Amino acid sequence: GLVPRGSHMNVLVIEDDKVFRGLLEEYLSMKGIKVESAERGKEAYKLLSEKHFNVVLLDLLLPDVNGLEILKWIKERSPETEVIVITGHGTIKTAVEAMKMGAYDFLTKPCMLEEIELTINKAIEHRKLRKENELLRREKDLKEEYVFESPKMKEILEKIKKISCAECPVLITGESGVGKEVVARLIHKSSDRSKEPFVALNVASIPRDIFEAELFGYEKGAAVSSKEGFFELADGGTLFLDEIGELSLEAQAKLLRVIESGKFYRLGGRKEIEVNVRILAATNRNIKELVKEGKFREDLYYRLGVIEIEIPPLRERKEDIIPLANHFLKKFSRKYAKEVEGFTKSAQELLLSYPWYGNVRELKNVIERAVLFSEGKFIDRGELSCLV
Amino acid sequence: GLVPRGSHMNVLVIEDDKVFRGLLEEYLSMKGIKVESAERGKEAYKLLSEKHFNVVLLDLLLPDVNGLEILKWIKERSPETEVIVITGHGTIKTAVEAMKMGAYDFLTKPCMLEEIELTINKAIEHRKLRKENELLRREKDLKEEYVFESPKMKEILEKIKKISCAECPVLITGESGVGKEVVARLIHKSSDRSKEPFVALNVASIPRDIFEAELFGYEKGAAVSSKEGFFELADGGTLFLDEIGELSLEAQAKLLRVIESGKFYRLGGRKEIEVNVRILAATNRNIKELVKEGKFREDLYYRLGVIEIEIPPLRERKEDIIPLANHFLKKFSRKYAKEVEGFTKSAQELLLSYPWYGNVRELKNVIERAVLFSEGKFIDRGELSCLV
């Protein structure tokens, strides 16, 4: 209901009735919202075509226009615009129709002032949530194309297609420096919850204590106020745990319960929490050994590992090396405003013959350095020999 | 109103009236929501204490308990729980009080079936938006502590404190490989919109065409459907453009208009868009030269550069080198499950004397490689000599 001082939410009030229109403009204005109004549909069409509005209050009983037609027009051209429709006490079902057509809520005319305020409040709130929701998602989408032409990565793609199971966990393994998050995303994209969020957690970059608190949440004590876990927040979606080797035994036990029952408790809590989260797990480690050393639960390992995607190292996928290296060269050449356009023939042969024990991470790091110190259009073998 | 098939949203209906309680449970159930109910407040207290509920429908006129007390209790212990209160036609102001106390919406008893459905729909929607909103934000928070003990970085911190201007742009400059996003975040944190979102865009990692479309959005044509820009979505918040040197002249012109008027148009649009977005800009380039070469607008450069934070290179902040290197060693040692705990004395002297022309990025890359190929508890000079 309340907007930040430094925000410019634009609201249009379309209402032929002077008194009611005034009430609407007054409250919106009291709330620091930028308000404009129209008395007629024709006037509204013009305003809407020349200025974008974030929320619209729409009378469905205008004198010279059919309100639903404005709603329909707004939603096909500007679905980002939230519409609250204003109806009479007589016509309720027209309000229902409006909802079907994409309206957010409705106001019955007349009503109590408090009803108006509350309706407007929740409409403003809704817009802000949708805006921020879209912002954060698109910020993510921009931070992620995968280049893998090798036959082994292609067959991995084929294996991913074969996964028809919706909730079954998947384990993704590979040497240190091998990218496993790309594969996890591909699984998510092909899954039946592809339109639900995908959350990546780097288990190895967050200290344990804070990680378990973040993952499962906690209740007051053990630590001032309640904090829901990523598991609760990821309900309906997919949670990718980058390095499960870094889970404490206690976290592993909770994880298995989530996978098998969907029910668990926050840290030091007594409230059952119930979620449906699809687990994708990765590790650059030997879990089989960790189990034998008592550092990892056998039952969790079996559960995660039923479906396992083994990503082979770069040296076993030599077809991917040049495409990756060229991608990184292009990326960093632009970042650092360098002239370099490619690798010499001699340089490429060196890239292909090097084992890349660090795999893609090492490759990326080597190229970034080469690009940083490059001169002219090419990186030659000598510039890599030092590095690799 | 509709939840995904693979989600476990838990809803509690607290209602003494058999008929109305039934109507509520019926609809929630038809929608595939996991429903439970209580006829009395005491019963409700027990259910709520033993199982977490995501949404609660709360009768405010229970026979043996005061509804507002349940609301108050829920909101102090479990504000994550959305509460829709059920009231009588007589008591409206008690509903208003409930809203003040944190209730999301209210239902008047009795009402039309369609009213119930719509109220429940928007409550479910609200929960999902809040959940995903919290998920995405906390995913971000987890991906970001800055270590800078050098006097020059300290005085930069002091300069950041002096910025009392709320909307004024800031330009952050420094050599290639110097981290400018940390400084941009610190400015945001100290700003008067610190509680609003902070959005980072890597201008140099997104191809131009798609970047301008993403930033300013577009209207139908020029490209099927309307897409609002990051500028609209970042309204009320702070937008950090990592490398402004990579903006086309057309994008620069639009950017200046946003900064000065807050009004602009999407690509090929005729709707005025009005936002209040605080611009933080960074570049590892010589904008002064780009202006002279006609590749950058003079007026935009002047505007962005009024307040400028110049981050000096690592070699000029030698006090930051070991803390950074130790941070990266710790980080990557855990990532790759290595034994290494620190650098030898000889290794540290090499780190301190090296110019770090790539600065922090180069440092990070060198340490990652050293850690990857390390053996035992230490990295010695010889392991770096090769690299640096």
Say if CB A109 and CB A17 are below 8 A apart: yes
Say if CB B246 and CB B288 are below 8 A apart: no
Alpha-carbon distance of A284 to A243, in angstroms, equals 7
Supply the CATH classification number for the domain A316-388: 1.10.8.60
B323 vs A: CB within 8 A = no
Say if CB B24 and CB B15 are below 8 A apart: yes
The residues in A 4-23 lying below 8 A from B, measured between CB atoms, are 4-10
> SS3 string of A240-270?
EECCHHHCCHHHHHHHHHHHHCCEEECECCC
Question: Are the folds of B1-145 and B146-315 the same?
Answer: yes
Phi then psi for A281, rounded to 5 degrees?
-120, 145
CA angle B218, B220, B225 (to 5 degrees): 90
Q: Nearest CB to A129: which of B133, B204, B246?
A: B133
The residue of chain B nearest to residue A336, with distances taken between CA atoms, is B176
Alpha-carbon distance of B325 to B364, in angstroms, equals 7
Of A84, A233, A71, A378, whose CA–CA distance to B137 is shortest? A233
Say if CB A12 and CB B278 are below 8 A apart: no
Of A196, A326, A12, whose CA–CA distance to B4 is shortest? A196
Structure tokens at B82: 């959305």
Please report residues of A whose CB lies closer than 8 A to that of B204: 334-335
Say if CB B361 and CB A368 are below 8 A apart: yes
Tell me whether residue A312 is exposed, middle or buried, using C-beta atoms within 10 angstroms of its C-beta: 0 to 12, 13 to 18, 19 or more. middle
A219-249 burial: b if 16+ Cβ within 10 Å, else e: beeeeeebbbbbbbbbbbbbbbbbbbbbbee
**Residue A119, CB half-sphere, CA atoms under 13 Å: how many?**
24
Structure resolution, Å: 2.2
Say if CB B137 and CB A230 are below 8 A apart: no
Please report residues of B whose CB lies closer than 8 A to that of A140: 136
Q: What is the CA radius of gyration of chain B?
A: 28
- Technique that determined the structure: X-ray
For B254-332, where are the E strands, in sequence order? 263-265, 272-274, 278-283, 308-310
Tell me the β-bridge partners of A93.
none
Residue B243 marked ligand-binding = yes
CB pair distance less than 8 Å for B136 and A140: yes
3-state secondary structure of B275: coil
Assigned superfamily of A146-315: P-loop containing nucleotide triphosphate hydrolases (3.40.50.300)
Q: Percent helix, strand and coil across chain A, each rounded to 5?
A: 50, 15, 35
Distance from CA of B21 to the nearest CA of A (A): 23
Of A200, A212, A210, A199, whose CA–CA distance to A255 is shortest? A212
Alpha-carbon distance of A182 to B167, in angstroms, equals 38
Alpha-carbon distance of B106 to B146, in angstroms, equals 46
A112 vs B: CB within 8 A = yes
B220 vs A: CB within 8 A = yes
Of B350, B355, B98, whose CA–CA distance to B370 is shortest? B350
| Neighbouring C-beta atoms of residue A377, cutoff 10 Å | 11
The residues in A 243-272 lying below 8 A from B, measured between CB atoms, are 243, 245-246, 262, 270-272
Alpha-carbon distance of A276 to B34, in angstroms, equals 12
Give the CATH class of B1-145: alpha beta
Residue B146 marked ligand-binding = yes
Tell me the β-bridge partners of B229.
none
The DSSP code for B60 is S
Alpha-carbon distance of A15 to A110, in angstroms, equals 13
CB pair distance less than 8 Å for B142 and A214: yes
Say if CB B8 and CB B34 are below 8 A apart: yes
Edge-to-edge strand order for the sheet containing A170-173?
A198-201, A238-241, A278-283, A170-173, A308-310
Alpha-carbon distance of A290 to B239, in angstroms, equals 44
Of A325, B355, A348, whose CA–CA distance to B366 is shortest? B355
The residues in B 70-109 lying below 8 A from A, measured between CB atoms, are 77-80, 92-93, 95-96, 99, 104-106
Say if CB B348 and CB B322 are below 8 A apart: yes
B361-375 burial: b if 16+ Cβ within 10 Å, else e: bbbbbbbbbbbbbbe
CA angle B315, B316, B322 (to 5 degrees): 55
Distance of CA B278 to the CA centre of its chain: 15
Tell me whether residue A306 is exposed, middle or buried, using C-beta atoms within 10 angstroms of its C-beta: 0 to 12, 13 to 18, 19 or more. exposed
Of B58, B109, B108, B110, whose CA–CA distance to B85 is shortest? B58
Residue B72 marked ligand-binding = no
The DSSP code for B306 is S
Q: Would you list the domain boundaries of chain A?
A: 1-145, 146-315, 316-388
Alpha-carbon distance of A34 to A4, in angstroms, equals 12
Of A139, A332, A364, whose CA–CA distance to B177 is shortest? A332
Best residue of B133, B193, B224 to probe chain A, by most A CBs closer than 10 Å: B133
Which contacts (CB < 8 Å, 24+ apart) does range A112-118 have? A112/B92, A113/A23, A114/B92, A114/B93, A114/B95, A114/B96, A116/A23, A116/A24, A116/A27, A117/A1, A117/A27, A118/B96, A118/B99, A118/B105, A118/B106
Alpha-carbon distance of B22 to A147, in angstroms, equals 55
The residue of chain B nearest to residue A383, with distances taken between CA atoms, is B387
Say if CB A118 and CB A84 are below 8 A apart: no
Of A198, A270, A264, A183, whose CA–CA distance to A236 is shortest? A198
Alpha-carbon distance of B204 to B207, in angstroms, equals 7
CB pair distance less than 8 Å for B235 and A80: no
Alpha-carbon distance of A177 to A313, in angstroms, equals 9
B179 vs A: CB within 8 A = no
Best residue of B3, B5, B8 to probe chain A, by most A CBs closer than 10 Å: B8
Residue A182 marked ligand-binding = yes
B130 vs A: CB within 8 A = yes
Distance of CA B362 to the CA centre of its chain: 27
Say if CB B321 and CB B352 are below 8 A apart: yes
Of A328, A259, A239, A350, whose CA–CA distance to A300 is shortest? A259
Say if CB A307 and CB A156 are below 8 A apart: no
Residue A369 marked ligand-binding = no
DSSP string of B184-235, one letter each residue: HHHHHHHSTTTTS-EEEE-GGGS-HHHHHHHHHEE-S----S-EE-HHHHTT
CB pair distance less than 8 Å for A136 and B138: no
Q: State the distance between the two ends of chain B, measured CA to CA, in whole angstroms.
A: 59
Say if CB B277 and CB B261 are below 8 A apart: no
Distance of CA A5 to the CA centre of its chain: 28
Phi then psi for A164, rounded to 5 degrees?
-95, -15
Q: What is the CA radius of gyration of chain A?
A: 28
Structure tokens at B296: 């950058």
Alpha-carbon distance of A233 to A236, in angstroms, equals 9
- The DSSP H or E segment spanning B303 is helix B298-305
A209 vs B: CB within 8 A = no
